[PDB]
Design a protein around this nucleic acid. Sequence first.
DNA 1: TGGAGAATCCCGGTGCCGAGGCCGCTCAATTGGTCGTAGCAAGCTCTAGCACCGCTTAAACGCACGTACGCGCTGTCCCCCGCGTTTTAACCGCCAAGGGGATTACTCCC
Length: 59
Amino acid sequence: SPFHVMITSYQLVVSDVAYFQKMKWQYMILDEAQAIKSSQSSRWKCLLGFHCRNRLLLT
DNA sequence: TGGAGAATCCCGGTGCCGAGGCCGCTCAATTGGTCGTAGCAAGCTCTAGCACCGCTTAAACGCACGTACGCGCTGTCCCCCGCGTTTTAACCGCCAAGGGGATTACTCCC
């Protein structure tokens, strides 16, 4: 495959959300998950909805 | 009439990018029922639109006839065109910036 892991910004996942939906992930890292701590944040609402089989938070 | 040569066309080849079709999904068009009302219908009023007559005289017409002006002609000259030279700035590409608008954090105030 042309990739195994994909690195991206907390900014792009909310901006390109319509492309991030329509995709399915085997594993996900959130690399400094204190970015997610506001449940009112769009980056909480969006990354929550990413179809991912197992998820990990780093903090 | 010919001719030379420039300018316009045509024929086939190359390639690139945008036109035409496929895919996922949202959300805007459709199905179903409600309820208010407006404008469709029947009816009365009398406005004002159309028709006719008779008179008046100003406005329209046919004609005479003069001369003012439209038009083809002639001459010139100046200034705008066709072509070669010189030069400048439009186009392209690539990097910078900044700005602004949406988002996210954290506190104070209610």
